């Protein structure tokens, strides 16, 4: 696509001792209009891998179709080999770079999260084929507003618990609701652990508007 | 870039500078602008470094194949024609090549100018590059067909030196080659600082 039409804002990701947590709001915007308010931008790829996307929702749905079919095709063989989060990340990088090289990009920024062999995976792919790994990730405006807080926590305390990571994600979502114009108050939280992928649905943030009375 | 070549009684003289530039940044001061196609045939490079290198290496491969098939060495005219035909296929696509093909064949000494625009001209004196205008004046005021070998060497060195003095995109060292009937020799590589000492 050359012009995105219906888009999603920012996706957040943090790894903790024993898994990964990913968060995204449930809004699809048609320009400045909050048009589709109940859409899910997080996907369960397989028991170890989950995916979240920002950008063109139609391109995201195409990718969900292709990835789901690939997973089903692998499970038909029954040979005891599955795709790791890292392999899905590499396949996504190749797909995006191939589309960019044909001058027909997929207008998405993707976060891949996973847990395999007692190890956590968090990966970033961009529209152009820039891909990397990090202990915390944020796309879009979250790169400016959320990555500072996450990075500050991670530099001091490099290993987190599930409780701490979830609390940090909720704080960052609140900040995004305060300062991003394309944001929505309902979000979803996906977690991958040794038990697999769990998605927690419409969650809201508690806001504070006391400074409204300080305007005078 | 300054490249120069002339035919005289005792053969062909080829001379070049060694400065490679990317904008106003001097990437290199030891670059090689003369390609050795075969022991009897030389080529010069001006313009796009990658273009000239790739296409003259391709010419070298084709000339070796010619020698294998026909059991005879290729002529200068045929080699220049091959290069011109090769680069005409990519016209308008943005190739920047200015080349001199020099050698000795059954017709004697040969010197041909081939550019990416499509020109293929024979001649006795040529200069290509940014500083070619400055080299032309010195070469034209000093050139004779009856030069002695040392005189020809000195003339080529002087012309490249003056070009590097006036042109911002020329400099480094003067690399000199002499094409004779039994093959080319590497004459010298002289830094222009030492030449400034000698000429001033």
């Amino acid at each position: 696509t050359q012009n995105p039409m219906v888009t999603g804002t920012s996706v957040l990701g943090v790894k903790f001792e024993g898994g990964v947590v990913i968060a995204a709001d449930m809004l699809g915007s048609y320009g400045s209009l909050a048009r589709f308010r109940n859409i899910s931008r997080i996907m369960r790829v397989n028991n170890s891998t989950m995916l979240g996307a920002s950008g063109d929702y139609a391109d995201f749905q195409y990718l969900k179709q292709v990835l789901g079919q690939m997973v089903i095709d692998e499970e038909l063989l029954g040979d005891g080999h599955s795709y790791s989060p890292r392999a899905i990340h590499s396949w996504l990088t190749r797909a995006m770079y191939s589309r960019r090289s044909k001058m027909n990009p997929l207008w998405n920024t993707m976060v891949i999260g996973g847990y395999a062999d007692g190890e956590s995976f968090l990966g970033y792919v961009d529209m152009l084929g820039v891909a990397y790994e990090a202990p915390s990730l944020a796309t879009g405006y979250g790169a400016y507003l959320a990555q500072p807080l996450l990075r500050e926590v991670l530099e001091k305390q490099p290993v987190l618990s599930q409780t701490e990571a979830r609390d940090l994600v909720e704080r960052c979502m609140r900040v995004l609701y305060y300062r991003d114009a394309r944001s929505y108050n309902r979000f979803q939280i996906a977690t991958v652990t040794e038990k697999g992928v769990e998605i927690e649905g419409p969650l809201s943030t508690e806001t504070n508007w006391d400074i409204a009375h300080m305007i005078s | 870039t300054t490249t120069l070549a002339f035919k005289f009684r005792h053969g062909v003289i080829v001379a070049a500078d060694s400065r490679a530039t990317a904008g106003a940044y001097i990437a290199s001061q030891t670059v090689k602008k003369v390609i050795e196609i075969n022991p009897y045939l030389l080529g010069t490079m001006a313009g796009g470094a990658a273009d000239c290198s790739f296409w003259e290496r391709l010419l070298a491969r084709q000339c070796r194949i010619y020698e294998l098939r026909n059991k005879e060495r290729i002529s200068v005219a045929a080699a220049s024609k091959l290069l011109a035909n090769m680069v005409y296929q990519y016209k308008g696509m943005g190739l920047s090549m200015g080349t001199m093909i020099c050698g000795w064949d059954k017709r004697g000494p040969g010197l041909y100018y081939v550019d990416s625009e499509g020109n293929r001209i024979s001649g006795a004196t040529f200069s290509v590059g940014s500083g070619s205008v400055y080299a032309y004046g010195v070469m034209d005021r000093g050139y004779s067909y009856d030069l002695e070998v040392e005189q020809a060497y000195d003339l080529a060195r002087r012309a490249i030196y003056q070009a590097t003095y006036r042109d911002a995109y020329s400099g480094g060292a003067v690399n000199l080659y002499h094409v004779r009937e039994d093959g080319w020799i590497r004459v010298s590589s002289d830094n222009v600082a030492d030449l400034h000492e000698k000429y001033s």
């Binding site: 063989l77 040979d79 005891g80 080999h81 795709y83 790791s84 890292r86 392999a87 590499s90 190749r94 | -």
Partner: protein
């Protein structure tokens, strides 16, 4: 006979005679043995050529850091299949950054080999393959036939007079799982010795070995490298 010249013709008995004729090519070739322990996989090949000046023809080929193959039959077909397998493994590394599982490679080979057996003017691949591999499921030995059928084996010998090697392997197969590397290789060498005419023996010249395992890339031991293994091998009965 009007049924034995084309691969597209069924006989009244329900057979395709061209595929059987292609299996004859594997039966004529030199013998190879393959076996697996719980940690390693070994391919032993009987190299030979036409004359003594002619160096013994290459039977064990390197496909990937975790996969190697042994050949029986038409060598040019074997090189075609080897190039196909190498390209498939390379594409898997390019796209998924992981090695290709061995079973999926054998599936791809079977798919490639079946197509020529259904089309007019084509022929089967007159090559029999023995594949040794290591992946996340352990060590594997696979057999490939010109009929496009493939087998997952505990051990296997293919080639000329390989029935005697298969007999030896069946007798001793319960030991293989608990062996170390030298013992496993010696078992394979004894099985391969079972095919030679009674006068011939195993030398450093006519034997090639190929080993893969948990922490070893596929290695081809030929010449002096095989002397460590040929040592300590009792004479034939």
């Amino acid at each position: 006979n009007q049924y034995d010249n084309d691969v597209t013709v069924w006989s009244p008995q329900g057979r395709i005679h061209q595929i059987e004729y292609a299996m004859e090519a594997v039966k004529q070739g030199s013998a190879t043995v393959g076996l697996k322990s719980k940690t390693h996989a070994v391919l032993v090949a009987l190299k030979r050529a036409q004359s003594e000046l002619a160096a013994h023809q290459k039977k064990i080929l390197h496909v990937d850091n975790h996969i190697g193959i042994s050949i029986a039959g038409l060598t040019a077909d074997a090189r075609l299949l080897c190039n196909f397998m190498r390209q498939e493994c390379l594409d898997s590394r390019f796209v998924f950054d992981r090695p290709l599982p061995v079973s999926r490679l054998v599936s791809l080979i079977g798919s490639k080999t079946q197509i020529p057996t259904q089309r007019y003017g084509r022929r089967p691949y007159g090559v029999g393959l023995l594949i040794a591999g290591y992946d996340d499921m352990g060590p594997h030995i696979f057999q490939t036939c010109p009929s496009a059928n493939y087998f997952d084996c505990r051990a296997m010998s293919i080639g000329a007079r390989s029935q005697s090697a298969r007999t030896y392997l069946e007798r001793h197969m319960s030991e293989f799982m608990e062996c170390n590397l030298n013992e496993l290789v010696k078992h394979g060498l004894r099985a391969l010795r079972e095919t030679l005419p009674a006068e011939q023996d195993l030398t450093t010249k006519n034997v090639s070995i190929g080993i893969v395992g948990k922490d070893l890339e596929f290695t081809i031991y030929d010449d002096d490298d095989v002397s460590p293994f040929l040592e300590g091998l009792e004479e034939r009965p």
